[model samples]
Target: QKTLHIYNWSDYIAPDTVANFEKETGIKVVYDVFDSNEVLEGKLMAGSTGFDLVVPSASFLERQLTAGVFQPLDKSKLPEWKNLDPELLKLVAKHDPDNKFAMPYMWATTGIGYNVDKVKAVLGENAPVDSWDLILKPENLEKLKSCGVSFLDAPEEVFATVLNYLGKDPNSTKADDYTGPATDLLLKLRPNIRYFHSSQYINDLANGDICVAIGWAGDVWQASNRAKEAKNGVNVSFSIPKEGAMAFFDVFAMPADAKNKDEAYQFLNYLLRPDVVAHISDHVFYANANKAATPLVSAEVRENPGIYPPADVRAKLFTLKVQDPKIDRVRTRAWTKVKSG
Candidate 1:
């Protein structure tokens, strides 16, 4: 009842979430952050990370589960689980199976983020803004390079995006698909990318420093709001490319070595409270997995297609798979080639 240490994505929770949890449960919260899946996985896999709770994307969680990084959740202790979206839980079940080890927190997509005026000026009215052609095509990338273009430094995400563009399976287990077409396509456009990073684009897009970015849907929306609030000339927008993209869930799981299970469950149940989840969604601009939280989220955020994608766009989005070791190393090497070239 005295402490709960939580490791989560940077800026992923409401500013006052810890305070509220402490206020209600008398549990002092110590929170930490990681911005990438790789960073979290490295620590979790090494053992004794000292965190009672950690958030990991489902794809990473799938593989981590195989390594015994997390312990099964005690559903009997999670009274707030009733607030979770059953449909979303069914989707996450692909990785966690009977919903044993993880609880869905936020779901997001990897897609396009662009400065409307700058992108249009570069490609004109007929630009393929709604498709992967906007960034994956070397011709478009070449032209866009004059303003600025960036891609996430995340290998799995970039590889999946490129594979999807090339009409290959995004989650293909074939090592050849990664080393061949995916690496080749990334190499073609590598010369045009201004930089490869995960979080830098949020500010860069808002400041009008970059014209385009392949980024997470919520991060792009954060940029859009930032640009609007700052009254900058930049007009930012996010699109789930017509060719499709990756949809992922960030979930809460307890490390196998957790020192404070009861406190962790208390905080986890607090997080599932509908009002609390809605507030976090409003602050972070991501879709919460709580079914009851939907009505509580702000109108602006709830109605935004980028946050809660329409059926058509949702239909095209794919979730990544747990890659075999052979494909994983190949993806690492493939990403290295694109980054270096």
Candidate 2:
């Protein structure tokens, strides 16, 4: 591999991953970051992003395939592709159907992350720590608002979460669902929210500034570790709500407009290796999709439910299918109303 360009979520990788990959492959990986799928999609939709590979969520991958945004992965070229978790491969196949376009990179749940002590001080020692009640219920959030509170800026995620909390299918394309109960629930808590963002809350939570947020599993747990390292007594923690959550898969796919497929294959296969990915799984605190890499992953990582979410909890977890473009427009409109309120 001589050269490769990667576009992924901002700071989503092991800090030294590029250094190590270059050391082994003698390939200069030109890495770039995108903080949202919206920004990444805007580029891919307009023209070539000039990247060999880009990480897009499963639903985005599903929609983009019809538009000819990515090439079907020639798995025969990636000898170590077999290292991927067979079950996860089948799961992602829900979107790609034949597992043709994308290979899962990492997966996570969207749930609650909070300051353990702040929550206890507000809700008492027997708080519904692993439940959505903390943020969704107006009374609970009102108490937390004093310390600090936030929810992800993602409308799809926030609306889906409220749907799940209300015993409805999160993937429901009905406009009324988005505009009625889900929006109602959010509006009640909007006054308590400090701001909406996909990031920022991570650092704020680590520094003992924000008390709670609805966020991604990896980023939340990553905050917990950062506080621990800083000895700041931040006591940050995460949980997949007892009510279940929106599970998402971030997968790697080669954009069809890519200039260098050969080098891209080499760089991607290097990342699939169990030994190399183990340290990555450890450092990032996200569940890796490589099954063979499990043993190599740290005991701490393997055992944490916040990272992998155990079986009983897994039974309740669900994911959304690709929405029709009309549903997207409806959601965007309702999201504007929710935010403006």
Candidate 3:
């Protein structure tokens, strides 16, 4: 039997899915998890030996494809490929020109998740429109700081939040273009940040250790559920910032030197099964990319605002675009300084 090595995010796969796959196919499935896109990219660039499959966000996939780090996926090998949502398939094509590599696995958005009681206490009935200013301004900071607000720990995301706050396109990478008022606004908001974090922020927020967190849709949904089950009945709400937000698709792709290519395709096909996709949606709390799974998902899962969100709200969201490496490095360095100082 061949072994299939899969690299993905923590808690991303449905529980027991891997064991089930291994049992059915007689293929040993080894799994690894990464905390950020950059971490995953760095490993792949350094040579992802023995990794059969990897899940990377669409934006990062653009960079990896350009660098020739992944192998083209032969759709013929994946019989379930036809079941993928058409819109999501288009996104894959948009990011990967030849469709040589990449398959849409899951999708979500970056949004604001706040303690409802806290927001009501400070902002009162007149809550701010879903704008970046909710976490950017000093006055709002004072209210949030007491509760210890948290932001996404990723450098590009933190910088992008600042860029969006000052009304600049967050994905802008041209040095001259990024030089507008956004930079100044970021400098001003520097002292207000309590800390930056990734998925771990979800735990902090649920524990009331933090009142507000800039987070992805999936984590917030999962955290809110955790809070509801707790004694306090803490309420967390997620909203798309009115200024705009970054949207990205998480995609499944084969590595350049996967040994069990056939087994990998079988795994992908199994994931596409309606029941399996629905099962994953139940556990992960993220919208599934398989159209066939829609009807099978629970009504609560289907209706959860944090998961499905309204169309108008989604219209305000934006996906991160590929940017110049040089400019990205500058933003990254600036973010590091901001966090350290």
**Cα lDDT tens digits for candidate 2, 1-341:** 46789999875788888899888778888999998988998999999799999999998888888899999988888999999999888889998888889988999999999999999999999999889998899999999999999899998888888998998888887888888888888899999999999999999999988999999999998899999999998999998989989989999999998988988898789889998778888998989899999899999988998998788998898888777878888888888887887
Instruction: Give the least accurate 10-residue stretch of model 2, judged by summed lDDT.
Output: 9-18
Candidate 2 vs 3: which has more lDDT: 2
After superposition on all CA atoms, what RMSD does each candidate show versus the true structure?
1.2, 1.2, 1.9
Number of clashing pairs, model 2? 0
- Each prediction's TM-score against the native? 0.97, 0.97, 0.93
Writing each residue's lDDT as its tens digit, candidate 3 over 19-125 gives 88888889898999987888889888887556899999988898888888888888888878777888777776778875669888888888888888887787776
The lDDT for every candidate, in the order shown, is 0.91, 0.90, 0.79
Evaluated at residue 71, the lDDT of candidate 1 is: 95
Off by over 4 Å in 3: 177-180
- Supply the TM-score for candidate 1: 0.97
Task: After superposing candidate 2 on the true structure, give the runs of residues whose Cα lies further than 4 Å from its correct spot.
Answer: none
In what order do the candidates fall by lDDT, top score first? 1, 2, 3
Better of 1 and 3 by TM-score: 1
Top candidate when judged by lDDT against the true structure: 1
